[PDB]
Write a protein that binds this DNA or RNA. Sequence first.
RNA 1: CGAUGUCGGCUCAUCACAUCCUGGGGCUGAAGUAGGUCCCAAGGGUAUGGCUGUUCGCCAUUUAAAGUGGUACGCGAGCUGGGUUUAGAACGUCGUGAGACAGUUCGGUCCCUAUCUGCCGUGGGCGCUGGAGAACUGAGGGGGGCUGCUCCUAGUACGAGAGGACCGGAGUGGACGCAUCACUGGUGUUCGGGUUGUCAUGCCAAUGGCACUGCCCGGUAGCUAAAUGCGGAAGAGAUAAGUGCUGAAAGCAUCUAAGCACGAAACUUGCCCCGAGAUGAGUUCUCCCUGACCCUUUAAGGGUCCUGAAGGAACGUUGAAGACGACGACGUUGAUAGGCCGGGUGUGUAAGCGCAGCGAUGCGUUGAGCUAACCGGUACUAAUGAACCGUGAGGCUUAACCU
RNA 2: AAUUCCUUGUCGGGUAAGUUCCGACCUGCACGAAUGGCGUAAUGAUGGCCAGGCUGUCUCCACCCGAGACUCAGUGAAAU
RNA 3: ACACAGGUGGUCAGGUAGAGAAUACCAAGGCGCUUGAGAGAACUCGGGUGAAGGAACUAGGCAAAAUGGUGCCGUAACUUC
RNA 4: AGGACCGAACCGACUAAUGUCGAAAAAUUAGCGGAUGACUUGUGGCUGGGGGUGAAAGGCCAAUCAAACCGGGAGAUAGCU
Lengths: 209, 56, 122, 120, 114
Amino acid sequence: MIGLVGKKVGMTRIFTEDGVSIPVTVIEVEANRVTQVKDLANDGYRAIQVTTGAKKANRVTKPEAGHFAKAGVEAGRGLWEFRLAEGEEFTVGQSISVELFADVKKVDVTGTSKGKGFAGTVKRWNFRTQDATHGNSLSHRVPGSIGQNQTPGKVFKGKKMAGQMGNERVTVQSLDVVRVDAERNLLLVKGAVPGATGSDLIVKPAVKA
Amino acid sequence: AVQQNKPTRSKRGMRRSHDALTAVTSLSVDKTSGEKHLRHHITADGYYRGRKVIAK
Amino acid sequence: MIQEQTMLNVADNSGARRVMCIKVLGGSHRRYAGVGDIIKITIKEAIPRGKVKKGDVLKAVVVRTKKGVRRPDGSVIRFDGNACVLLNNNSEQPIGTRIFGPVTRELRSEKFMKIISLAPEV
Amino acid sequence: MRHRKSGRQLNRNSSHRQAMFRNMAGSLVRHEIIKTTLPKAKELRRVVEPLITLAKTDSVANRRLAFARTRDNEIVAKLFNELGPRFASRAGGYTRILKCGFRAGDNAPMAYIELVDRSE
Amino acid sequence: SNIIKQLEQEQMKQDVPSFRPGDTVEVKVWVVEGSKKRLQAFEGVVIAIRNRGLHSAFTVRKISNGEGVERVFQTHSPVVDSISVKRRGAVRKAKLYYLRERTGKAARIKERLN
RNA sequence: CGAUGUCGGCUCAUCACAUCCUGGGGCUGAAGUAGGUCCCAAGGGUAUGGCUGUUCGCCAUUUAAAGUGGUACGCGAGCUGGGUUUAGAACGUCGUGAGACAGUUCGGUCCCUAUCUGCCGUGGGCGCUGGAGAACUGAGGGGGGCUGCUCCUAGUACGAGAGGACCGGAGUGGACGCAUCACUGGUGUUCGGGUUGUCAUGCCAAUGGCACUGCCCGGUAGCUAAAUGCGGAAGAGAUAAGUGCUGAAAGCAUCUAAGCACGAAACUUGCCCCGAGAUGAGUUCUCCCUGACCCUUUAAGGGUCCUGAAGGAACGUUGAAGACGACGACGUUGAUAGGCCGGGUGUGUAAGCGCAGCGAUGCGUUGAGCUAACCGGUACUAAUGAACCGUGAGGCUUAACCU
RNA sequence: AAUUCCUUGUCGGGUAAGUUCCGACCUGCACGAAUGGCGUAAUGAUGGCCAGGCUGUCUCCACCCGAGACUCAGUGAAAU
RNA sequence: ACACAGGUGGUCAGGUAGAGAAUACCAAGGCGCUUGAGAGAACUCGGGUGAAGGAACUAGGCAAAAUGGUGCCGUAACUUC
RNA sequence: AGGACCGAACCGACUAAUGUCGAAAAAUUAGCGGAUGACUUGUGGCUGGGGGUGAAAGGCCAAUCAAACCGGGAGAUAGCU
């Protein structure tokens, strides 16, 4: 089916009355509201468009302010889309709540990760560090040899090297949900989800079973 | 760790393409003295947002 | 977090005094062994009578560790000496009569029911 | 990799930063306005304003403590009698920065930082 | 973040008999014996408090058979039954990690009648 | 030969398959179990120490296995220098002697700021044909693909027993991988305290400076791994080796020639990420501009003034975003930053005084005082009005339709 | 054996495992008596091996403080 | 070769602490080293701390860590005593 | 008493790192050795090229040494480039 846009509030624990203290993640999903329903007649596919949150009216722009005033929904931060599964007919303006997770067991969180900046080859790819002494001369963390010789004569494409780590969209699937509270519009999922406390993230039900 | 062939006037000139300098494009005028200062800077005379705050 | 060359204190009246781990079992490239695990050891110190000689290679199981176990609540039991018992190399069924000091409850693996029984505490 | 860190290293080690800010705070208290680099002036703003908060109470201890910082009695005497109790209605910003031009020697972003009264 | 604090004050236990480091305190917990359920007692000296709300915990050092045993205890857990302070202890610090090396009678600490 | 640095080690690989394990089969001197042999298969995986400079080997102990090879016996503008490879010295030894011996021992300088290709990242310009902000499509490409063990089936089949399954299911692991800071831990020269010497603040007290943070014990946030979650699949498609059904040529027979059915980690999707520079430059939504005027070798012509929107850009406060560009938040109609305000945390009973004591110092005020990046609140300071850039309804043909 | 080619000889000791170390055995390729033989207290930045202690040597790196690297302003080489 | 982390003989040599002309903080006196300003990436140089383990590293404990004082007590083989 | 001991000035140069178009045509940092003696150092002399001196490495003799450096034989010779 479809998933739901939310925001990470941080991680907490939950003690159960038998023992175990599961680590949960706090996700404040708002009332997600549909602004555009796409269908295969004049769009080539069927999907839905969803905004959430709230937006400064002096910080919403005239090409985008009209995009909500044609939907008749209230301007939220950012737009997202979801591929429908051929049995889920919605309409433009139906505010989808957190009641769809009334019987979902493992949701698949997709969000962005915390940026490491320019990483080194030891952090980014777990290259083992060379010897710190026995004469090793200004080489204590270098990536070492990168190729072979004259016969391949070049650097193979796809070589793990230094560069950017983090700041990437990442999916984690099969994370068990433990609370679907609807008065506070909260969601408590096992384990850790992609980082940056306060950043948006897309929850989706499990493809894998 | 050295060049093997002398590069040209083109490869010299094309590397210099982004090494040109920008422009200020706008000089904000102040209320009182009417002087052209930088945006968010005090004037060379001393005023800022129409006030001799510095008493220079 | 017991590993190669780790000196351990024996935890039964078998004749050992001080044993060194030489191999952790159960998996290729395997690093540290915790409390549930079986390691191959040697004998670096012995009791004169004993049941073992100095320089015997045989199997052991860590019963106490300085790194400590973690309960289902997150409560960690940290000891002060990395201790273990001896096992008869083939079909283990431990070598010994008594157990000294406290063992932890993660030795309930149904083949260490003897080590549960002979231990005084926990 | 500097997430959520505060403070500036300012190309000075730990003594020199602490000693300069102990030092530079004195002149701003003494002369009511100083002209520094803008990156210095923003981190000077994090030091003097706790001291003016100390001068919002004229205790025996707060003399000793605001003497323990900045080490100078005349700087303490400028507070607690003149600069301190005059500022004790506007809890909050006590110093105002203003951007000025670039230093002729090495092109540095000069700025003033000054107390919000400077009245005469 | 009120949202976490909403979810944190709904869960902390309320009894919580307050003490200090240095104290000798007997903690009783729940040994789940499969489908049977008994209760034991862990009694020793608190080395440290890790006081942060619901996430708070505390250590306890028991000497037994020449093997110093340091268990920590997440206080707001429903396996940690009760806390009974036995000996109020006088310590000039909030951590007591020198108890891992001082042994015997030169490890025991003072009384706190006050 | 106007120089291609020559063994092994380390770091990093990557291809072949003549396959070591895992997968699929046929044969067996294949009862089961465990094996032998051959065929198919390269997706993933494929030890640690001892001795030696060694590759190698030997031994110890694991492992599902401890694969053969190619890559300048891969790898020194990446490291090492132990070996071989200068001068010194010595033993054996050969020579009258200088000295000599891939015979022995001891010792013995390893340079390069990367223009070009290449690769890892990250942007600027132009394009995409009215200008603009978003949201997608998916051609194309990359990543991942490992398995042990116990248990159920089942002491069942099998077998004299001894022993001990097939096929399917459950669970707990070892390695690797992605993410994460709740937990447990490390760090935490921006927090608090203890303290040695010396100096200084006129003196006491109380403080500070220097001594690697002077030495120390703690320790917020952030950042981490040993901490904790999560993965590898199922399924579907077409096949390999193989197995077959029907079935002639060849009245029989026969897996193939027609036709038809299954068949493996390899193949194609399914999982994840990049992605319309995919110049084949894609689709939907939406928003914005509808002024006259001269001239010309009159052409998608050029120029003059009146206008300059959507927006962007620039500047400022700035960030779990960052080498710099970039990316996000915010600019008074404001909570973006600092200060502040109450709290949390951490340190652990400040000072001043009073009391006790010859004194050090102990008590009571007092779990005080001080608290960094944290949490919730507050316009007190700072984010100025403006200006800049971007225009004025957007080519020709034909079709299909309204006129 | 600083000497032994065969050779990692053989035995013993040390190690879970020892081509090096210690003790022996003589089968001294090709020791040997002032180009000295054999011992030997003390000595040595002397070679070889072992044991306690200590530890980021390492398992396997993490964080931190600073001086560069990066940004701007100034000056401004070089081998090829 | 330079306003070059180099070399250069003799003389005087204060307070605290200490055996001291060591060292540490100061005196007298002299200096802040003739480029700066930010940022807080990789990797390099100099350092700090480290869970569990403790030489497994490695040609080799190279480097590092560790020991460090005074007073009394006690001290092996061997020996040229 | 001692070519005696630990240890600064002083003299030396074992190991590591850095540095290797250097701060420097042999240094810096950290540690290491002698340290009343065959000690070290100033001043001046003396020993000249197949010669010196050499606790001896084929070392040193003005950043040069299996025969210095300067001029001269001299445009040596060059079956080689």
